């Protein structure tokens, strides 16, 4: 039965590789070498948050570019105020193993989850005056990697074993489950149109899903190790992938290619997070060498180096307005840069 | 500032006080981790102490414990193992009755798992407590079968004590770091409320050694 496979699979992969190889007239550097360099950029530490007592594993920015959420390895989940460094809420978790926090696009819900195979959703605006658990999401078999909001009624999650799911909140039942990977899935990002998103596997592969139907439309390869973070281009036609091979890459949707590889000979550590800046000119990437490098988008030249941490950087993000940059580490501190 | 800003900073100070109290309360509890090979004596080990991760909770002689179990995780181990850096000890269950069962020797798989857990770069400063579960089965199983099927290089008779010593020393041999960590290797089937006593002795010894290395002259 596998005898037909051992030829048809190879024929199909060759017929899908030959065209994309024959549509590779030039590169990104060859065309964008004429643009002027961005010059060295310097960023100082503006505010430092001193609340946690353990490692910090996640961070997310609210829509208003003022509020913040953090989830520490201890049973806590603190909501900060990025302008005055106060605390507005503090949530005690039922399980002490969390690996992702997410903030609603409106400002009324906060979701978390981790090794407990469940995704808890908390409600912030309540008549009583305290955070109360709303729904306990179940149906997964492995650890919970990352979760994101579409609206106040739907959520996309990235399981541990193979699956990524979409379910509504009124009924704790999965609406659509799509599986095409072979290995763990860690990171996912949502396109602005809310109709498409991409997920990064651990078998050196990234796929592009469809929210409405539930099929996989495109696939990309190229890395020699696992992928740990993905962020979309602001436009909505590209995304960057971080790996443990000590390199970042930039893919294109309509091209089905890889454009440029960002890797230096001095760096040998791993990459834990990646996020684009506004207008898609800078690419902030977290590193395991105790630093956070800043790269150029249309060129490989390295911009300034953002180094103010005593442990490895795990999560970072850029606000919607584009002013602030936040980084978290396995130390208790969470820094805000500008 | 306004009145609302002062109220907000008062709320922030209250939250900080509560968090400090919670950290101080939770800072004096022992954390452990059980790792096993397939279906081992873990089920009967957890009995005398009193989805995915399961938490077990008990106290003994004015000391507070907190035990985890991640046997039913079924994922890539090297990827979620970061979170257990702060554990005090690592309990390990090994079956002595699987030296003839094959599924590929079962005891050799247990040895490989012990090697991978012990020489991992994270747990380099943490002790290991080894439980040898089955006793009564070993007595009736040695008399009929030769132990050479599990380790051919052994030379000796078919008594009990030499076989037990050989198994214990071969398990203890794989520890490359002789100085930083120590192994204890207690037997079982004598639960008799004695296993909790052994765990208490081991944890108090490891905590006093950790304190001596941290602040003392060691």
């Amino acid at each position, epitope marked *: 039965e596998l005898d037909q496979l051992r030829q048809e699979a190879e024929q199909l992969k060759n017929q899908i590789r030959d065209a994309r190889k024959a549509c590779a007239d030039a590169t990104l550097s060859q065309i964008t070498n004429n643009i002027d360099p961005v010059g060295r950029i310097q960023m100082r530490t503006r505010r430092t948050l001193r609340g946690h007592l353990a490692k910090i594993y996640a961070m997310h920015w609210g829509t208003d570019s003022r509020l913040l959420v953090s989830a520490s390895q201890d049973g806590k989940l603190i909501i900060w105020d990025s302008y005055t460094t106060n605390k507005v809420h503090a949530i005690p978790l039922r399980s002490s193993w969390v690996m992702t926090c997410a903030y609603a696009p409106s*400002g009324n819900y906060v979701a978390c989850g981790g090794l407990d195979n469940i995704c808890s959703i908390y409600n912030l605006k309540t*008549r009583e*005056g305290n955070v109360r658990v709303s729904r306990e999401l179940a149906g997964h078999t492995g650890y919970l990697s990352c979760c994101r909001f579409l609206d106040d009624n739907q959520i996309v999650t990235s399981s541990g074993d193979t699956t990524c799911a979409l379910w509504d909140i009124e009924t704790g039942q999965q609406t659509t489950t799509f599986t095409g990977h072979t290995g763990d899935v860690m990171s996912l990002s949502l396109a602005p149109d809310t109709r498409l998103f991409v997920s990064g596997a651990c078998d050196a592969s990234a796929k592009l899903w469809d929210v409405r139907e539930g099929m996989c439309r495109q696939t990309f390869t190229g890395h020699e190790s696992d992928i740990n973070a993905i962020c979309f281009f602001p436009n909505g036609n590209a995304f960057a992938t971080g790996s443990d091979d000590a390199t970042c890459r930039l893919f294109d949707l309509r091209a089905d290619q890889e454009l440029m590889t960002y890797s230096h000979d001095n760096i040998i550590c791993g990459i834990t997070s990646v996020s684009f800046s506004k207008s898609g000119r800078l690419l902030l990437a977290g590193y395991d060498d105790f630093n956070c490098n800043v790269w150029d988008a249309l060129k490989a030249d390295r911009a300034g180096v953002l180094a103010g941490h005593d442990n490895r950087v795990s999560c970072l993000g850029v606000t919607d307005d584009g002013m602030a940059v936040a980084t978290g580490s396995w130390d208790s501190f969470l820094k805000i840069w500008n | 500032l*306004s009145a609302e800003d002062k109220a*907000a900073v*008062e709320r922030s100070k209250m939250i900080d006080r509560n968090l400090r109290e919670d950290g101080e309360k939770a800072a004096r509890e022992v954390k452990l981790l059980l790792l096993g090979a397939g279906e081992s004596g873990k089920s009967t080990i957890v009995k005398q102490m009193k989805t995915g991760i399961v938490e077990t909770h008990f106290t003994f002689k004015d000391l507070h414990f907190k035990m985890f179990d991640v046997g039913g995780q079924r994922s890539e181990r090297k990827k979620w193992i970061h979170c257990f850096e702060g554990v005090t000890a690592i309990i390990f269950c090994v079956a002595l009755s699987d030296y003839d069962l094959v599924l590929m020797n079962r005891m050799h798989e247990s040895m490989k798992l012990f090697d991978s857990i012990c020489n991992n770069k994270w747990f380099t400063d943490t002790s290991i407590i080894l439980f040898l579960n089955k006793k009564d089965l070993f007595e009736e199983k040695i008399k009929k079968s030769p132990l050479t099927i599990c380790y051919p290089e052994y030379a000796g008779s078919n008594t009990y004590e030499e076989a037990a010593a050989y198994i214990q020393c071969q398990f203890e041999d794989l520890n490359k770091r002789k100085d930083t960590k120590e192994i204890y290797t207690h037997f079982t089937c004598a639960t008799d409320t004695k296993n909790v006593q052994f765990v208490f002795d081991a944890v108090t010894d490891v905590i006093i050694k950790n304190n001596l290395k941290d602040c003392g002259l060691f």
Partner: single-chain antibody, 233 residues
Framework: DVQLVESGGGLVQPGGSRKLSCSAS????????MHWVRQAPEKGLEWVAY????????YYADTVKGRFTISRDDPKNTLFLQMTSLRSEDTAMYYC??????????????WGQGTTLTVSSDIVMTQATSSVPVTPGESVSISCRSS???????????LYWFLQRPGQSPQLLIY???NLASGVPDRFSGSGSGTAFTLTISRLEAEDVGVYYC?????????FGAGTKLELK
């Protein structure tokens, strides 16, 4: 669901003493701050006392500096207010109030029911209007002025609005300039700036008859207005 009930008060000789009490019912009493608001038989709305979260900051009014004491006990979820020397200007309903303070909070959310006693410099909101005839199906506007400009350096004004129908307790309508509250219809709009503030409604119904008040929250001594009755001929 949320309920505040307060009781205890009769007739007192001019110089006696009595103690009030208010009991909570399931709203996480330990995380909020409470107030006390006074109202003579047919007058406006003064201010009496205050207690904060954790029994920290405790600020009183001007007239009642030396005869009132405010205290709370988190167990049993009750609040008290003692009295020592009472003159003939202490006959009023005392209207226990709730309040929470954070970045997006809504102070003065829930107002209690009230008791009854019969003993037998700062900002001044004018609100010169007293009574205006109204008819259903049209838009009316009420004006308010303040001595000091309320636009702080943070960028947000501090002045609220209230409604009180005849024979019950007040409720919050807009908890700043241009920030509508929950549980109130969306036919209201602040549209204020500087020192001349206003409030317009879309259509007037039979449930909107009552009195509207103003309140400032820059300086801690909270002053009030005088009222604006709608008669609805």
């Amino acid at each position: 669901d949320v309920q505040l009930v307060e009781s205890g008060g009769g007739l007192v000789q001019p110089g006696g003493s009595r103690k009030l009490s208010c009991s909570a019912s399931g709203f996480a009493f330990s995380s909020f701050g409470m107030h006390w608001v006074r109202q003579a038989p047919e007058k406006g709305l003064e201010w009496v006392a205050y207690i904060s979260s954790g029994s920290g900051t405790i600020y009183y009014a001007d007239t009642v500096k030396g005869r009132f004491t405010i205290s709370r006990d988190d167990p049993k979820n009750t609040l008290f207010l003692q009295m020592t020397s009472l003159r003939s200007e202490d006959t009023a309903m005392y209207y226990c109030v709730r309040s929470i303070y954070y970045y997006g909070s809504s102070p003065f959310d829930f107002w209690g029911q009230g008791t009854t006693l019969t003993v037998s410099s700062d900002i001044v909101m004018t609100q010169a209007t007293s009574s205006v005839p109204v008819t259903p199906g049209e838009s009316v506007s009420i004006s308010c002025r303040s001595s000091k400009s309320l636009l702080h350096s943070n960028g947000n004004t501090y002045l609220y609005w209230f409604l009180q129908r005849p024979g019950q307790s007040p409720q919050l309508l807009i908890y700043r300039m241009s920030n509508l509250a929950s549980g109130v219809p969306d036919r209201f709009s602040g549209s204020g700036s500087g020192t001349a503030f206003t409030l317009t409604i879309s259509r007037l119904e039979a449930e909107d008859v009552g009195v509207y008040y103003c309140m400032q929250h820059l300086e801690y001594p909270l002053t009030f207005g005088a009222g604006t009755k709608l008669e609805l001929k």
